[PDB]
């Protein structure tokens, strides 16, 4: 059981703002209740599923394509206009295309006996919505803060693993350098002893 | 300028629900406007910074402690009473076995309730809009952070597993380079034994 409360401007009353409350079950296609209020009075109407299917046919539109138009227009490139006569309680809206507009919807609303009850329920629904949202934003704010920390934590854990690797790397190399260079000392020594011996043999050959 | 709209029940009409709207600038301490409505009529009252602190004196409470009680009672066990005939509004606190008047206001019946009710509804819809947007922004950050975390965690896994393969991988190479030095040392010894 869903609902959307939107604010709208009527052509015959550009000064004041009105509110539209549409409520349905599952989909608009199965039918919906529409209520118009100016904060003092309220007008209500119903549209059955069959009424929707028929209106779609009378408008030469594919049903789902028609319900799509209703969504964009009633549940808030697509320009829509709304009209209402307090004297007849007739409510209708048109879609304004280029130089060509057309009746999109028409409802004969009935002035409600209990405006206040209707307005109170509407405001009550809005406040409950504001409430449910805050709870959610708070639950997300904590989850945000938890992740900010959980990242900072592993980030450090990372830097430490990397720093530990570098310290171990240089540490190993340092030991290697020593041993390798000690052998190079031996090689240089033996190398030069061999040259000495070579020059010795050459002296024996020359004299 | 901030505001809070609470749903309340009056003692003399447990049946119907009423709405209390309180608005202010910065802190209630500098004065506030309170509006009561039943969706048809509306009653308003202004409480000046002067009056508030005046009340904090009559009680003998720090202006701070006193404003604190109002925040708990007006911005939402607290009891509310209203007489449509006198427009007098008062609320009390109820503790275990006792209750006491916590405050009151002389409200005045508004001339154009519909205007007030329309502005209240408008505010609620804007709030629902703003809150739904934030719920999206925070919902994505929650996603970014989730990803960013996995990233680094992966880096960690890879880094720790590399510090554990180091000793073993560097030592083999050392053995290789080292063996070469040894072979050269052997051949040189060998050549010195030649002559």
């Amino acid at each position: 059981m869903e609902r959307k409360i939107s604010r709208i401007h009527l052509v015959s009353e550009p000064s004041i703002t009105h509110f539209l409350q549409v409520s349905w079950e599952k989909t608009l296609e199965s039918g919906f209740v529409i209520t118009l209020t100016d904060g003092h009075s309220a007008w209500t109407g119903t549209v059955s599923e069959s009424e929707i299917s028929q209106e779609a046919d009378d408008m030469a539109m594919e049903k789902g394509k028609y319900v799509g138009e209703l969504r964009k227009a009633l549940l808030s490139a697509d320009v829509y206009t709304f009209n209402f006569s307090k004297e007849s309680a007739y409510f209708f809206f048109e879609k304004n295309l280029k130089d060509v507009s057309f009746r999109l919807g028409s409802f004969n609303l009935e002035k409600v006996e209990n405006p206040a009850e209707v307005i109170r329920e509407l405001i009550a629904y809005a406040l409950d919505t504001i409430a449910e949202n805050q709870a959610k934003n708070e639950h997300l704010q904590k989850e945000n803060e938890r992740l900010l920390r959980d990242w900072n934590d592993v980030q450090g854990r990372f830097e430490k693993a990397v720093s530990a690797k570098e310290a171990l790397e240089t540490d190993l190399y340092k030991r290697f350098i020593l041993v390798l260079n000690e052998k190079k000392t031996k090689i240089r020594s033996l190398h030069n002893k061999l040259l000495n011996a070579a020059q010795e043999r050459e002296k024996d050959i020359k004299q | 300028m901030e505001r809070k709209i609470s749903r309340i029940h009056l003692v003399s009409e447990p049946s119907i629900t009423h709405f209390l709207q309180v608005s202010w600038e910065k802190t209630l301490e500098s004065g506030f406007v309170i509006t009561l409505t039943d969706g048809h009529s509306a009653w308003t009252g202004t409480v000046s910074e002067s009056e508030i602190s005046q009340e904090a004196d009559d009680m003998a409470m720090e202006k701070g402690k006193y404003v604190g009680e109002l925040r708990k009672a007006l911005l939402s066990v607290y009891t509310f009473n209203f007489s449509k005939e006198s427009a007098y509004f008062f609320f009390e606190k109820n503790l275990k076995d006792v209750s006491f008047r916590l405050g009151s206001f002389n409200l005045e019946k508004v001339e154009n309730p519909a205007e007030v009710i329309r502005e209240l509804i408008a505010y609620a819809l804007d709030t629902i809009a703003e809150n739904q947007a934030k719920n999206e922004h925070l919902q994505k950050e929650n996603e970014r952070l989730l990803r960013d975390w996995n990233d680094v965690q992966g880096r960690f896994e890879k880094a720790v597993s590399a510090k554990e393969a180091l000793e073993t991988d560097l030592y083999k190479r050392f053995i290789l380079v080292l063996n070469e030095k040894k072979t050269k040392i052997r051949s040189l010894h060998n050549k010195l034994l030649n002559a």
Binding site: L180, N181 | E180
Partner: peptide, 28 residues
């Protein structure tokens, strides 16, 4: 006589951090 071994490490001149890292990386 050769100056370097099959891996690029000198048989005669001492080495150090920078040079050995080069030799190792060359070993796969």
């Amino acid at each position: 006589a050769r100056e370097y071994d099959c891996y690029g490490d000198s048989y005669f001149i001492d080495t150090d951090l920078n040079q050995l890292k080069e030799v190792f990386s060359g070993i796969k």
